[PDB]
């Protein structure tokens, strides 16, 4: 499929904890997406797997709502336990098995050693759907935030903090990951997290509005 490269544009910030803080500058050391980096633009008109390298920032600017679900694992041929996040119009189905399953080809709208069967509300829903996945201490954490875009050119300029969804303590040794499609095209951005130090800014309403990446330029190190 067609690849491209574009700037991150100070985007990919999430709430690091479930604590309300207002009108205070807070310093956090966590796996963040560094500022002004190159994320990779994939055009899915066509597919080897993508490496899960210490965290993945996922974005999609698609109005037609085609993109759906993910696969996580390390070798993906029934020789390992693999995470499978499958979404639909009603629920989500998250499961860990050996998983020689398939939903990528044209089988759509016109088990083994199972550990857990978490089903919940759906994840997904001129709009940008931002996602952050990470795997720390055996715990799989998913952050998400949907933000409308006015001029569909690239990743927007500004800040939009991401809110946590679920903190699954299952998912072991994630190395490679995969994304589905849907046909009756798909375009998504993929970025890689890094152990950086940030300096978050809260307003009087408790919302993150500005941030400073402490290892970008010496001016930001002076600010930090």
């Amino acid at each position: 499929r067609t690849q491209s490269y574009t700037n991150s544009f100070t985007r990919g910030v999430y709430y690091p904890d479930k604590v309300f803080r207002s009108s205070v500058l807070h310093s956090t050391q966590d796996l963040f997406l560094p500022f002004f980096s190159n994320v990779t633009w994939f055009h899915a008109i066509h597919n080897p797997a993508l490496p899960f390298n210490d965290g993945v920032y996922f974005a999609s600017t698609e109005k037609s709502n085609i993109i759906r679900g993910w696969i996580f694992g390390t070798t993906l041929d029934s020789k390992t336990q693999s995470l499978l996040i499958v979404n639909n119009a009603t629920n989500v189905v998250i499961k860990v098995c050996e998983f020689q399953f398939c939903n990528d080809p044209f089988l759509d709208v016109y088990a083994n050693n199972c550990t857990f069967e978490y089903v919940s509300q759906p994840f997904l829903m001129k709009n940008l759907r931002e996602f952050v996945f990470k795997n720390i201490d055996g715990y799989f954490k998913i952050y998400s935030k949907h933000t409308p875009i006015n001029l569909e050119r690239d990743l927007p300029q500004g800040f939009s903090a991401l809110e946590p969804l679920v903190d699954l303590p299952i998912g072991i040794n994630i190395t490679r990951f995969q994304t589905l499609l849907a046909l009756h095209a798909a375009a998504y951005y993929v970025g890689y997290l890094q152990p950086r130090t940030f300096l978050l800014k809260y307003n009087e309403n408790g919302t993150i509005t500005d941030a400073v990446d402490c290892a970008l330029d010496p001016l930001s190190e002076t600010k930090c």
Binding site: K18, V19, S22, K79, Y139, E163, I172, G206
Partner: protein
């Protein structure tokens, strides 16, 4: 406060007045289910250490006193908490991990330690908060012909991350020649049996280990111990208990816009400013009740035993545990006169005090 029986003329800072709490408040979530620790600690068969089971304990009330009745163990060895304080405070979720090891490897179930079980079978994180419960199992997990149902892995390419499991069994290779599924030269199966016998020594006996992993309060609480709730009162200095968070202060209504995943509000001094009530989803401001300094204004004991008390920095309509209001607090026991003398005892912003004649008494003036 001066360690003397005679005091001289001047103003002395003695102590601070504090409003004592009147009532007590305990706020716990309305959960009536009982946590199934009997299903964990009393099982017919336990899994091996390479395929250890994990059980999620949630949406129930946990009583930790029945654990001693369930299994005959010695030590309830906890790390981040104490075994005697488990019934007061509470957590989000509790996970129970159960496996069988050898008596030599019980010491390896600890945060920050290497070995054979701790590197290839079961690794604990460095920020482990929980208890490890282990007891002997010579009567149920030992046979005279040997045991081969309990397997452990001793060969792996890399060390295991904390709380990770490995099920897949491949032919391990420690050389350039590939095994290709053949257990020949330099090819070993990673799983080998313990081989438990009743005639072994005390350090080689089978041990049943149950590891309870608590995670601290970040989400709404789903498992909480046996403690009755109390009705919530406001605008009074009381003692509160919000999901194990004890303290003293005044609970008022707030206009803070908490996001729906946030259950706490912290301050610059790392103290809880606001709390969310677990029964009714409302936000309460926590502020300490009234305090301030107390200064005693006296002449010498050679002159008189009369004193005047200055309550520093307060608007004294809330005095207790002649009245004149100054900028340094307010003065009780000295009469303000409309005269001007030289300063004798300095009090505050242009206010002094003296022991005068116009019957002797303590006066205050500019």
């Amino acid at each position: 406060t001066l360690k003397s029986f005679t005091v001289e003329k001047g103003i002395y800072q003695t102590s601070n007045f504090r409003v004592q709490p009147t009532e007590s408040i305990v706020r716990f979530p309305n959960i009536t289910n009982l946590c199934p620790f009997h299903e964990v600690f009393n099982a017919t068969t336990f899994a091996s250490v390479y395929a250890w089971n994990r059980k999620r304990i949630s949406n129930c009330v946990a009583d930790y006193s029945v654990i001693y009745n369930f299994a005959p163990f010695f030590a309830f060895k906890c790390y981040g908490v104490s075994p005697t304080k488990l019934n007061d405070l509470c957590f989000t979720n509790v996970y129970a991990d159960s496996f069988v090891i050898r008596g030599n490897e019980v010491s390896q179930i600890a945060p920050g330690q290497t070995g054979n079980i701790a590197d290839y079978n079961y690794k604990l994180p460095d920020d482990f908060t929980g208890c490890v419960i282990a007891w002997n199992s010579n009567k149920l997990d030992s046979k005279p012909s040997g045991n081969y149902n309990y397997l452990y892995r001793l060969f792996r390419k890399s060390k295991l991350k904390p709380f990770e499991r490995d099920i897949s069994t491949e032919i391990y290779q420690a050389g350039n020649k590939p095994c290709n599924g053949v257990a020949g030269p330099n090819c070993y199966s990673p799983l080998q049996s313990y081989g438990f016998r009743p005639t072994y020594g005390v350090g080689h006996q089978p041990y049943r280990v149950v590891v309870l992993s608590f995670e601290l309060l970040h989400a709404p609480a789903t498992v909480c111990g046996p403690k009755k709730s109390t009705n919530l009162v406001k605008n009074k200095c009381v003692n509160f208990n919000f999901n194990g968070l004890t303290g003293t202060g005044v609970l008022t209504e707030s206009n803070k816009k908490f996001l729906p995943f946030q259950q706490f509000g912290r301050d610059i001094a790392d103290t809880t400013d606001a709390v969310r009530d677990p029964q009714t989803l409302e936000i309460l401001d926590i502020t300490p009740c009234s305090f301030g300094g107390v200064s005693v204004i006296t002449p010498g004991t050679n002159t008189s035993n009369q004193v005047a008390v200055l309550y520093q920095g307060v608007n004294c309509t809330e005095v207790p545990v002649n009245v004149f209001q100054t900028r340094a607090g307010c003065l009780i026991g000295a009469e303000y006169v409309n005269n001007s003398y030289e300063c004798d005892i300095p009090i505050g912003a242009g206010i002094c005090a003296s022991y005068q004649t116009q019957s002797q008494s303590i006066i205050a003036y500019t």
